[PDB]
RNA sequence: AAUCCGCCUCCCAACAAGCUCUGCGUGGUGGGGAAGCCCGGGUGACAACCCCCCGAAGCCAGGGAGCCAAGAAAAGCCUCUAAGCACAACCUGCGGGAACCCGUACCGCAAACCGACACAGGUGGGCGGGUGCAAGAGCACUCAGGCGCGCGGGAGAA
RNA sequence: GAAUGCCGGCAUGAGUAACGAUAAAGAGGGUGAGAAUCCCUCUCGCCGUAAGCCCAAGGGUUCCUACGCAAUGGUCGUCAGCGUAGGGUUAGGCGGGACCUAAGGUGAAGCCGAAAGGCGUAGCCGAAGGGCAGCCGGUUAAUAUUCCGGCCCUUCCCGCAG
RNA sequence: AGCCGGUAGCGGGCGUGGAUCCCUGGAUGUCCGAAUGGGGGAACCCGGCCGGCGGGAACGCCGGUCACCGCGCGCGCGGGGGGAACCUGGGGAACUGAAACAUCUCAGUACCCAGAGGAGAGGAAAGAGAAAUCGACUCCCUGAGUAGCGGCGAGCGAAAGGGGACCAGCCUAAACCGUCCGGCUUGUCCGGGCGGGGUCGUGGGGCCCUCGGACCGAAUCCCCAGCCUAGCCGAAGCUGUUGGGAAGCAGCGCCAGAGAGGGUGAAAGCCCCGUAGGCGAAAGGUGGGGGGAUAGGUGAGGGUACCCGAGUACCCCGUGGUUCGUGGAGCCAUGGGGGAAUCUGGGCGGACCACCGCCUAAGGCUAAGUACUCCGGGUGACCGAUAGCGCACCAGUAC
């Protein structure tokens, strides 16, 4: 019905896995199709461009590359780890995402 | 047209009468027309609007039969 | 519903269409199925002139590829219409 | 060589089956089937047409349930029929089968 | 049913006419209009537009004669009357209004159709000019128009 | 490892036969990276009861123009019926239909047949036959009895008059 | 929490005021197609009537309606065509086999036609066949390659019984009573509807006497549990190191009703999707289970001899079916001829007769157990692009 995405535009997250293991950086976009996220400041790339109205001068512009959506886990706003997401039911009675460690909440 | 602008269509709509429905959508197929023409000859840069339209005439065309179904 | 802006859809841009607003012979896409008669009415509502002279023909479309696609493009139908002495419609006129 | 109208009696398919020598109970060696092939074996069909109600029906019917036309005919007194078309009438009768 | 048609009798007319329909001619009016010259067009040009002859297989036509093998139908059309209706209705003249759907490009004896091909094959109808040769749709040359056939350059054996 | 096996790939013959009517070519100028082959001029030859023109089949955008040459073109290609794009087919009178019938087809009535189905007067359908009112010129890169110009005509509705 | 399909781009919008998307219901649905106003070379053409639109009478458009056939007192309901196999019925080959061929085989197969459905068929004994017996039908195992059939060749090939699956039995016709209608040969008349009545093989029913006067219960309907058509919750890992990349190796842990499996830059129980275990429907579909109504169902003696399904049984002729090919050839079925009876009636137990037994023909319905796989899912000592479907790809396409 849908892709699962664990994680959201733009929560703070932590690159677990890669080259860019370690950092840490907000979600910029969420593709639920290519089941990736773009990290910002994470996964750079060089990419050439045609001498353009768009690009005068030329040469080469600087992309952020789309990360596989497994190997991101989004750093909780309260005990500030990185964690797995946990499902919990409000009054509402609503469902928001909890972080696993502590109990606080992601939105 | 923005979702609450949407609900608002159908408010309006469904306090009309079949007669008034019917000189309205003449009116939107009308105003679609104009869209066509301006966008035909390249002078119509906001061009989801002429889907708008065509979605207004379906939903009040929908009303519409609403009310004749009984 | 059917209105008359059901049966007129765009207007002829082209160098010979163009050449008849000045005889007063405006030249518009019409739906395929739609009658010289009909025609008449509905340029008439849409423009508020008189119409005294309608002329259709159909226009096949074009087969046209996309690489390993062949396809066609949808038949149309236009219809020259002639306005009544001295009269104008000024949408067309535009030009 | 069609369908009767009362019994409903159709054409049934036989096998016509030619033999020589002589019977085992005559002394025979036995007897011996020469050729077997198929056939059609018609019902009885006759033209049967009776004055009913003033109107002249007629039924295509098997020999053997010629008398049931006219006891038909008899259980028809009890109807109003008159009036009606002969094709009509028939239906009348057929239905009282 | 019938005043029509058919049949019988009579009167007038008859290779006359009349009446009617078509062809051709004229016809108010509108059109076109060459060679050559100059860059499809401009000019020629106020273009001229006339006389004679040949003359169809085409037209008048549903003409005529002969012959035997004896040569569609139905509607439009005219006439008759029946139900009906005769304030209707139809005819004639005139006026205003109304007049829909499809095809229409291009090839069409062919490189665009049928032959797997831009294939020396096949494909129905009409037009098909001039001169000479007895005639002609024959033949030779030529008008208008269209072409020189989608590999070439050499050499000069068998 | 063989089945004149099956499917594909690549060889050989071989730079060989052939390049599709023996109507036929020659030069100059132009274009272009490239020209025997595209454009223009002059000269030469071929068709002319056609190898010219106009319809109908059939084909279905091949028509016109712009920009192109990988492949298609039996060579070449700047060219093309080829690639991309844009444009182009205008009717009361032309042809067909809203008219008629022909063979035949279908088929109320009716007849027949194991089933499917086969017949069948009427009627209906069925045309390059009957019927029916447009001729000359002008105009577009490309349509014209279709648009325009002149001069004519047909039916239907309604009204007036006789 | 993103979205405006594959599909990016140009050019523009939507979304926590809940979008895209997913399920359910509804609305719209040009023309052809059973195609159904009429025609027709399917997707085109042309009409009648009512209503509306245009200035609208001609003309055109919009809405509605108009085929034919069956059954029922013009009007109603139904029919028409389609579906991969499966199923019944009506017709029905040949190659081949017999090491030739005709009977026979292949085979009642292939195929054609009609029809039925989610199944169809069959089904409540005029049975079986020897048991002093069984007890509707269907389907499996077995009986059995038996009994037999057979140019006694090639070959063909049952049933009873036993083990199992499933389980269910019903409504009528007739006698007699009543009622409406019509017929003319006027009535204790004949006939046609409808209602009552009745449904059996220890024979049953009717009618006339006699005594006796609440239990069952649907295959129909109503509610409901359950299920299907979207989904949701779901334990446990960090660090070092090599490397482009860790899930590798190393150090120290942790979960487990979850160590099926697939991902993630390589080889991950603890990163992701999942997994064990749980939860979930407003709407539509189902509902064979649970509940409740309804229809329906129910005595005993004695007398009466009224009734118990007709061109039928029965006999003969021609054939089919059965293992049965004319054989001692019965049984079941029926094209032709003849042609009964109503329980003291009739069929059957393999010619026929006797005896002894069995059974109730000529009317109808009936779940489930059974067959199939277009569709959905699960699983493979199944294939892995010459394989596996003809097609992993825009294929019943190009050609
Ligand atoms: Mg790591
Ligand atoms: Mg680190
Ligand atoms: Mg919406
Ligand atoms: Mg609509
Ligand atoms: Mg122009
Ligand atoms: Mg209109
Ligand atoms: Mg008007
Ligand atoms: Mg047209
Ligand atoms: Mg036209
Ligand atoms: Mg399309
Ligand atoms: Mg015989
Ligand atoms: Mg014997
Ligand atoms: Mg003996
Ligand atoms: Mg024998
Ligand atoms: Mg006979
Ligand atoms: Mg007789
Ligand atoms: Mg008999
Ligand atoms: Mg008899
Ligand atoms: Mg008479
Ligand atoms: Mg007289
Ligand atoms: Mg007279
Ligand atoms: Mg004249
Ligand atoms: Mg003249
Ligand atoms: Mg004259
Ligand atoms: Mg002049
Ligand atoms: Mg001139
Ligand atoms: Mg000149
Ligand atoms: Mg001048
Ligand atoms: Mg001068
Ligand atoms: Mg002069
Ligand atoms: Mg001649
Ligand atoms: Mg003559
Ligand atoms: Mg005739
Ligand atoms: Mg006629
Ligand atoms: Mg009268
Ligand atoms: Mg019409
Ligand atoms: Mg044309
Ligand atoms: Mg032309
Ligand atoms: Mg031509
Ligand atoms: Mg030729
Ligand atoms: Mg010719
Ligand atoms: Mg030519
Ligand atoms: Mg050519
Ligand atoms: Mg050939
Ligand atoms: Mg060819
Ligand atoms: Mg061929
Ligand atoms: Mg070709
Ligand atoms: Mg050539
Ligand atoms: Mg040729
Ligand atoms: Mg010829
Ligand atoms: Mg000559
Ligand atoms: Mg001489
Ligand atoms: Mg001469
Ligand atoms: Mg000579
Ligand atoms: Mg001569
Ligand atoms: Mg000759
Ligand atoms: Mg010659
Ligand atoms: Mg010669
Ligand atoms: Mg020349
Ligand atoms: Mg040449
Ligand atoms: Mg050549
Ligand atoms: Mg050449
Ligand atoms: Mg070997
Ligand atoms: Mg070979
Ligand atoms: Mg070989
Ligand atoms: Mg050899
Ligand atoms: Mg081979
Ligand atoms: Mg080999
Ligand atoms: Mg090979
Ligand atoms: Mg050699
Ligand atoms: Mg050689
Ligand atoms: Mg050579
Ligand atoms: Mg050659
Ligand atoms: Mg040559
Ligand atoms: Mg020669
Ligand atoms: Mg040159
Ligand atoms: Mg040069
Ligand atoms: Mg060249
Ligand atoms: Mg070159
Ligand atoms: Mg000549
Ligand atoms: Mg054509
Ligand atoms: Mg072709
Ligand atoms: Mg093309
Ligand atoms: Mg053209
Ligand atoms: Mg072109
Ligand atoms: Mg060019
Ligand atoms: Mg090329
Ligand atoms: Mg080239
Ligand atoms: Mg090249
Ligand atoms: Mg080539
Ligand atoms: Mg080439
Ligand atoms: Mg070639
Ligand atoms: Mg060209
Ligand atoms: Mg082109
Ligand atoms: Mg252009
Ligand atoms: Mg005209
Ligand atoms: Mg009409
Ligand atoms: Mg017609
Ligand atoms: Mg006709
Ligand atoms: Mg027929
Ligand atoms: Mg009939
Ligand atoms: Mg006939
Ligand atoms: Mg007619
Ligand atoms: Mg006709
Ligand atoms: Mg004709
Ligand atoms: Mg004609
Ligand atoms: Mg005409
Ligand atoms: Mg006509
Ligand atoms: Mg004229
Ligand atoms: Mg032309
Ligand atoms: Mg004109
Ligand atoms: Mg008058
Ligand atoms: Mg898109
Ligand atoms: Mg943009
Ligand atoms: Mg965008
Ligand atoms: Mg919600
Ligand atoms: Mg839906
Ligand atoms: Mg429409
Ligand atoms: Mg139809
Ligand atoms: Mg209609
Ligand atoms: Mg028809
Ligand atoms: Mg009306
Ligand atoms: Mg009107
Ligand atoms: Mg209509
Ligand atoms: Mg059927
Ligand atoms: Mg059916
Ligand atoms: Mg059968
Ligand atoms: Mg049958
Ligand atoms: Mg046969
Ligand atoms: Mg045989
Ligand atoms: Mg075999
Ligand atoms: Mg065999
Ligand atoms: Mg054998
Ligand atoms: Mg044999
Ligand atoms: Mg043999
Ligand atoms: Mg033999
Ligand atoms: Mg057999
Ligand atoms: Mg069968
Ligand atoms: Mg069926
Ligand atoms: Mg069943
Ligand atoms: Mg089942
Ligand atoms: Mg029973
Ligand atoms: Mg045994
Ligand atoms: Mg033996
Ligand atoms: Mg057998
Ligand atoms: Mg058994
Ligand atoms: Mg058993
Ligand atoms: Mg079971
Ligand atoms: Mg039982
Ligand atoms: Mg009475
Ligand atoms: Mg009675
Ligand atoms: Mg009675
Ligand atoms: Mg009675
Ligand atoms: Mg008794
Ligand atoms: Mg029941
Ligand atoms: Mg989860
Ligand atoms: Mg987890
Ligand atoms: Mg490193
Ligand atoms: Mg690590
Ligand atoms: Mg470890
Ligand atoms: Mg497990
Ligand atoms: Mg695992
Ligand atoms: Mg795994
Ligand atoms: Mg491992
Ligand atoms: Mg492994
Ligand atoms: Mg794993
Ligand atoms: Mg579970
Ligand atoms: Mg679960
Ligand atoms: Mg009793
Ligand atoms: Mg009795
Ligand atoms: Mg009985
Ligand atoms: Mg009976
Ligand atoms: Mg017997
Ligand atoms: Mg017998
Ligand atoms: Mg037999
Ligand atoms: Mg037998
Ligand atoms: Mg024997
Ligand atoms: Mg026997
Ligand atoms: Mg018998
Ligand atoms: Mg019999
Ligand atoms: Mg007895
Ligand atoms: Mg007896
Ligand atoms: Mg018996
Ligand atoms: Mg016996
Ligand atoms: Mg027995
Ligand atoms: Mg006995
Ligand atoms: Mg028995
Ligand atoms: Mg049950
Ligand atoms: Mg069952
Ligand atoms: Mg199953
Ligand atoms: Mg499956
Ligand atoms: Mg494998
Ligand atoms: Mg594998
Ligand atoms: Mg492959
Ligand atoms: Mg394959
Ligand atoms: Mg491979
Ligand atoms: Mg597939
Ligand atoms: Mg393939
Ligand atoms: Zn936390």
């Not at chain 3, 062949?70 to 001295?86: F, S």
């Not at chain 4, 074996?41 to 109600?53: E, S, T």
Request: a positive charge.
């Amino acid at each position: 019905m849908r892709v699962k995405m664990h994680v959201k535009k733009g929560d703070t997250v932590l690159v677990a896995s890669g080259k860019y293991k370690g950092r840490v950086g907000k979600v910029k976009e969420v593709l639920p199709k290519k089941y990736a996220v773009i990290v910002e400041g994470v996964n750079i790339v060089k990419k050439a461009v045609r001498v353009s109205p768009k690009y005068p001068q030329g040469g080469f512009i600087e992309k952020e590359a789309p990360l596989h959506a497994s190997k991101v886990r989004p750093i909780c706003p309260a005990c500030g780890k990185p964690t797995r997401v946990r499902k919990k039911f409000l009054e509402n009675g609503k469902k928001i995402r909890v972080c696993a460690k502590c109990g606080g909440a992601l939105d | 047209m923005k979702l609450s602008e949407v609900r608002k269509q159908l408010e309006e709509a469904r306090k009309l009468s079949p007669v008034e429905l019917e000189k309205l959508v003449r009116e939107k197929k009308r105003e679609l027309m104009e869209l066509r023409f301006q966008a035909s000859i390249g002078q119509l840069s906001q061009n989801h609007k002429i889907r708008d339209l065509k979605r207004q005439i379906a939903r009040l065309l929908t009303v519409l039969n609403e009310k004749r179904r009984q | 519903m059917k209105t008359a802006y059901d049966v007129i859809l765009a207007p002829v841009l082209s160098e010979k269409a163009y050449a008849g607003f000045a005889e007063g012979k405006y030249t518009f896409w019409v739906h395929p199925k739609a009658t010289k008669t009909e025609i008449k009415n509905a340029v008439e509502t849409a423009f508020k002139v008189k119409v005294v002279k309608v002329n259709t023909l159909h226009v096949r479309g074009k087969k046209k590829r996309l690489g390993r696609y062949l396809g066609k493009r949808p038949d149309r139908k236009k219809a020259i219409v002639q306005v009544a002495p001295g009269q104008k419609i000024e949408a067309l006129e535009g030009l | 060589s069609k369908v009767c109208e009362i019994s409903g009696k159709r054409p049934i398919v036989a096998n016509s089956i030619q033999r020589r020598g002589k019977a085992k109970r005559e002394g025979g060696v036995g007897k011996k089937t020469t050729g077997i092939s198929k056939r059609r074996q018609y019902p009885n069909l006759q033209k049967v047409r009776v004055r009913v109600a003033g109107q002249e029906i007629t039924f295509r019917v098997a020999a053997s349930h010629i008398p049931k036309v006219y006891e038909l005919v008899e259980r028809a007194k009890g109807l109003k029929l008159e009036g009606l078309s002969p094709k009509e009438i028939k239906k009348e009768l057929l239905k009282l089968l």
